[PDB]
């Protein structure tokens, strides 16, 4: 990222509410899946049982 | 019947691989899965990997990363667990149990209904080591001992008396030190009224080598 | 991954008790869970299996319990086959981690340790190296410290333990203390005296041997 | 069941007449199954192939 970023208002900065999570969906193909990854905000998120996860 | 019998090799140099092979007899794992447990002195138990029976995958401890290896061959009553870079702190008794392949409330449930007779597995180096004999003796209710000094390997049976295994016999369990080479201590609790008189024979033996030796306790003053 | 903590680590029990014990888990593991009554020198034999369901076989007083995260276990009747260690297991998700494993022993014939103390011998001198022990038996509970003043100074580190297990005539342990040395250092200092800490007891009972011919 | 049942009419019980079914659902670790019950009346289920099934 940029450094300086006009830091005229200096309110914070947006790690630690966004994560960057990959999962497998399909495809066009039914018979084909593939590893994406997204970057979602933490309040879209909820964090089931093996907390990596 | 389901039975599950392992020989191995036993006893193996440091740094060396451990080929444990577990003996299926009765039934056969055509779909169950077999795993490893092994059980360190005291303490606890920690789960080694996992192998199918109707296919070849192994599972994993991710403590153990890459140190795992496990097979599977055509009849399903032979399977072999290999470990690689083998350290010094792997002593425990590597037990061999069954998945439960049903249960009513679910199936190849990874509880294990059976377990094995396992063995009790030593690493270090020196090992070939005579034992060594040494009395003990108070100074002026007391007691005496027979302490047996790099030996090697377990156990060394204590006689007290051949026939005073009765009271007072505290058989403590035997000791590893830094160097590698165990002690192993011995008493037989006596009163204070029949000392210097009736002999303690103490015949402490060692099954490999049989060292026969006799001795009493001293009181000097 | 699951870390298992079962409480308590260590208890001890009569004969015909009511008995409890707890195994809390880190995240949630359903119901699924399995229990052991491991005795020392043999394989464990399964008891519970998803965490109510009684084993075919086992007796029928393993009233187990709990679900979710806080697992109980309880026991009716004491067998002389139930004082050994427990432990407790999941299988909900890779890996398949065990419990620390705890320990149910007969608490009886409450006493005060009884301490000993023997110089070495004249033919370990023969050999370079000293074997000077002091032993303690006839204690209840296990837990003990031994100190050794050293002319007033503490070389803690030699002093190794090895305890027997519960006994089956008056319940006791019998832990042998022994600090071993060489010529070169035994000689050196004045007083090797041990001391032992109970509650059972009066006064801490100092034993040591005269520097010299003792 | 409790022993009278109040048997005034005395025709039957519901056995022979419901039966359990249970089936598969995935859960976390590989090739583990676990059993979901649930009790049907005998109109309703009817048996393909492979008997018990
Ligand atoms: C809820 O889930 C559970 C579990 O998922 C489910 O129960 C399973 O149901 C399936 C389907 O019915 C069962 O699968 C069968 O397994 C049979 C056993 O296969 C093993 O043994 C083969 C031969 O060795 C044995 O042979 C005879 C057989 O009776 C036996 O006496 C001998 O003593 C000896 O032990 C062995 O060849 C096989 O390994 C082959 O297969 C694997 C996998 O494909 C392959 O990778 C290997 O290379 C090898 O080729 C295995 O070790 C098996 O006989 C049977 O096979 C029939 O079906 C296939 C496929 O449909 C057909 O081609 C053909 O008709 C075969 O005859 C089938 O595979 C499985 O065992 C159940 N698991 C249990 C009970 O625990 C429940 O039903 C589910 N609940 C529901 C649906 O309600
Ligand atoms: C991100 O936010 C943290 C929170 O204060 C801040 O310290 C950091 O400078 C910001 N930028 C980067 C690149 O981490
Ligand atoms: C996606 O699937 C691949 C292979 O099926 C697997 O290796 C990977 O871990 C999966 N990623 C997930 C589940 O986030
Ligand atoms: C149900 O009815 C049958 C009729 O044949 C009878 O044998 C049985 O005892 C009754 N009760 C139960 C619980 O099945």
């Known amino acids: 990222n940029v450094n300086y970023t006009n830091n005229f208002p200096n309110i914070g900065n947006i790690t630690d509410e966004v994560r960057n999570c990959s999962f497998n969906v399909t495809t066009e193909i039914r018979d084909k899946k593939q590893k994406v990854y997204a970057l979602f905000y933490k309040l879209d998120i909820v964090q089931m049982e093996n907390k990596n996860s | 019947q389901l039975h599950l019998q392992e020989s191995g090799p036993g006893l193996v140099r440091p740094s060396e691989t451990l080929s444990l092979t577990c003996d299926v007899s009765?039934?056969?794992?055509?779909?169950?899965?077999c795993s490893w447990i092994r059980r360190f002195p005291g303490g606890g138990l920690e789960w080694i990997g996992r192998?199918?029976?109707?296919?070849?995958?192994?599972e994993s401890n991710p403590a153990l990363t890459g140190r795992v290896t496990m097979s599977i061959d055509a009849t399903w009553k032979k399977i072999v667990l290999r470990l690689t870079s083998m350290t010094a702190s792997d002593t425990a008794t590597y037990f061999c149990a069954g998945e439960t392949p049903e249960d009513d409330f679910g199936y190849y449930q990874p509880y294990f209904k059976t377990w094995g007779q396992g063995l009790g597995v030593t690493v270090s180096s020196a090992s070939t080591k005579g034992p060594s004999v040494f009395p003990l003796a108070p100074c002026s209710t007391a007691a005496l001992g027979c302490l047996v000094k790099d030996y090697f390997p377990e156990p060394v049976t204590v006689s007290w008396n051949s026939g005073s295994l009765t009271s007072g016999v505290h058989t403590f369990p035997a000791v590893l030190q830094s160097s590698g080479l165990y002690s192993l201590s011995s008493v037989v609790t006596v009163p204070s009224s029949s000392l210097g008189t009736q002999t303690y024979v103490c015949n402490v033996n060692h099954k490999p080598s049989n060292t026969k030796v006799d001795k009493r306790v001293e009181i000097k003053t | 991954d699951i870390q298992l903590i079962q409480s308590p680590s260590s208890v001890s029990a009569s004969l015909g008790d009511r008995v409890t014990i707890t195994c809390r888990s880190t995240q949630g593991i359903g119901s699924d869970l399995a229990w052991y009554q491991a005795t020392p020198g043999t394989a464990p034999k399964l008891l519970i299996y998803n965490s109510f369901a009684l084993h075919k076989g086992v007796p029928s007083r393993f009233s187990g319990s709990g679900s979710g995260t806080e697992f109980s276990l309880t026991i009716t009747g004491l067998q002389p086959e139930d004082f050994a260690t427990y432990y407790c297991q999941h299988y909900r998700r890779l890996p398949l981690t065990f419990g620390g494993g705890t320990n149910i022993e007969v608490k009886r014939a409450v006493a005060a340790p009884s301490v000993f103390i023997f110089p070495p011998s004249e033919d370990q001198v023969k050999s370079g190296t000293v074997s000077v022990v002091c032993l303690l038996n006839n204690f209840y509970p296990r837990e003990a410290s031994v100190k050794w003043k050293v002319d007033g100074v503490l070389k803690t580190g030699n002093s190794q333990e090895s305890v027997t297990e519960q006994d089956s005539k008056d319940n006791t342990y019998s832990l042998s203390s022994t600090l071993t040395l060489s010529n070169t250092d035994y000689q050196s200092h004045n007083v090797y005296a041990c001391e032992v800490t109970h509650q059972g007891l009066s006064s801490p009972v100092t034993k040591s041997f005269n520097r010299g011919e003792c | 069941n409790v022993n009278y049942t109040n048997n005034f009419p005395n025709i039957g019980n519901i056995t022979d007449e419901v039966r359990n079914c249970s089936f598969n659902v995935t859960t976390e670790i590989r090739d583990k199954k676990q059993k979901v019950y649930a009790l049907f009346y005998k109109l309703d289920i009817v048996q393909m192939e492979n008997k018990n099934s």
């Open positions: 009765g039934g056969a794992f055509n779909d169950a899965y």
């Open positions: 192998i199918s029976g109707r296919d070849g995958y192994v």
